[PDB]
Enzyme design. Structure first.
Site, mmCIF file in Angstrom:
data_model
loop_
_atom_site.group_PDB
_atom_site.id
_atom_site.type_symbol
_atom_site.label_atom_id
_atom_site.label_comp_id
_atom_site.label_asym_id
_atom_site.label_seq_id
_atom_site.Cartn_x
_atom_site.Cartn_y
_atom_site.Cartn_z
ATOM 1 N N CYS A 61 0.833 -1.209 0.000
ATOM 2 C CA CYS A 61 0.000 0.000 0.000
ATOM 3 C C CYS A 61 0.866 1.256 0.000
ATOM 4 O O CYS A 61 1.676 1.452 0.912
ATOM 5 C CB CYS A 61 -0.929 0.034 1.215
ATOM 6 S SG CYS A 61 -1.862 1.569 1.383
ATOM 7 N N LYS A 64 -10.892 -8.649 5.265
ATOM 8 C CA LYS A 64 -10.424 -7.965 6.460
ATOM 9 C C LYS A 64 -10.930 -8.636 7.722
ATOM 10 O O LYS A 64 -12.020 -9.218 7.724
ATOM 11 C CB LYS A 64 -10.880 -6.495 6.450
ATOM 12 C CG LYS A 64 -10.255 -5.666 5.340
ATOM 13 C CD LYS A 64 -10.881 -4.278 5.227
ATOM 14 C CE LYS A 64 -10.504 -3.632 3.894
ATOM 15 N NZ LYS A 64 -10.883 -2.194 3.791
#
Ligand SMILES: [Cl-]
Ligand SMILES: [Cl-]
Lengths: 233, 236
Positions: A26, A53
């Site tokens: 990221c 997640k």
């Protein structure tokens, strides 16, 4: 190793440490990790599986975004720019933002000038990887880079804040590190000061320490664009 | 800031005098209102130069590349924009009353609350445009009510009058202009489900700085009427 659906929540952050919730590829989280390292802040990294997640992760960010900082006082700070600001203010050693209030404001104005680059670099990658037209996307990116090139040429300094690296450089870096693997290194072929800046950044101890493994990153992108959920594990 | 606007054909302002800072503004712009609140709250000596947004001065594009307001211009010829960056600059550059908290977390939290507010300015504008033109507004109002519910939750959780605690601070001034406008925009109904927010609105109106810059409702009504009538005098 990334935590996802089914993983137990982490314990409280110990006194003398700060935690960052991240993911190794990221670029927004990469910003905040650069600031953590550059300031020699004692921290731990908890990586998150962005595809699946952990349900507890929505107690850290309401939409499960990264990066998020968690303190030993159970305080949550997000996202990347606000986190970087907080770290520079909260940890006195090696200040990354300028001493001058105007210069600090100028760096934030430069950051605003950069606001289209993350989206454009991502769309370039997606277009190239899906075999879609990329001429307009690259042209748009080249124009945003020309705006940055003009700043460096006008200032006649290697970095965006001067002769030494500062906060603004770290805030921009992750997307420039990615040009190569994204297949868009050619988008700085018209901007010589920016090319010098890229090299100057690679020679920075903090940037160098956090440089991604190119082959592993390529492996990740290959499974990502195959829609293979194992890409995020 | 009760002065006429500078438009196409007007001459560029001279250098900003030492001891002053200049703000380029417009009397009814909520983003500029935000920065004017900060200038007033900190008792900063300043000059307000109003810009005709319909018929902008050519020279104004030397102050902002796209002719946006607000812009700060200093006595050292420095330009700072737009409203959020300008407000932060003012608070940090000028002594006396500090509007952001000293604590790094509390300051970061205020920036996070500002991010939570980011849809409200566009939604309030869209609601106004819809109502004034007789277009659909149910879904726009519902969207605005949801954003306000998010803010209400913050006040109810914290159990404080203001967004930064028991007294007014930077964050409250940053949000205020759009709340001041609910009444004349015809969307005061969008805080009917949020009692903490309604209390906050009153607390803000009672603040000396807010009160000092509070717009006369009839003059603001007149401006909007002129604006939607496409009368050029709205921007004079
Ligand atoms: Cl290089
Ligand atoms: Cl009220």
């Amino acid at each position: 190793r990334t935590l996802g659906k089914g993983s137990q929540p982490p314990g409280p952050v110990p006194e003398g440490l700060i935690r960052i919730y991240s993911m190794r590829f990221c670029p927004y989280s990469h910003r905040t990790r650069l600031v953590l390292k550059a300031k020699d802040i004692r921290h731990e990294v908890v990586n998150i599986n962005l595809r699946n997640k952990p349900e507890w992760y929505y107690t850290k960010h309401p939409f499960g975004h990264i990066p998020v900082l968690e303190t030993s006082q159970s305080q949550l700070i997000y996202e990347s720019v606000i986190a970087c600001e907080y770290l520079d203010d909260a940890y006195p050693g090696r200040k990354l933002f300028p001493y001058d209030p105007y210069e600090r404001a100028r760096q934030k104005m430069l950051l605003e000038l950069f606001s289209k680059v993350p989206h454009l670099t991502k769309e370039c990658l997606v277009a190239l990887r899906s075999g879609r037209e990329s001429t307009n996307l690259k042209a748009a990116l080249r124009q945003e880079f020309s705006n940055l090139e003009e700043i460096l040429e006008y200032q006649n300094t290697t970095f965006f804040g001067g002769t030494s690296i500062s906060m603004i450089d770290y805030l921009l870096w992750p997307w420039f590190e990615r040009l190569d693997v994204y297949g868009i290194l050619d988008c700085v072929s018209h901007t010589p000061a920016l090319r010098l800046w890229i090299s100057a950044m690679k020679w920075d101890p903090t940037v160098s320490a956090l440089l991604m493994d190119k082959s592993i990153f390529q492996g990740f992108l290959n499974l990502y664009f195959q829609n293979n959920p194992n890409a995020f594990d």
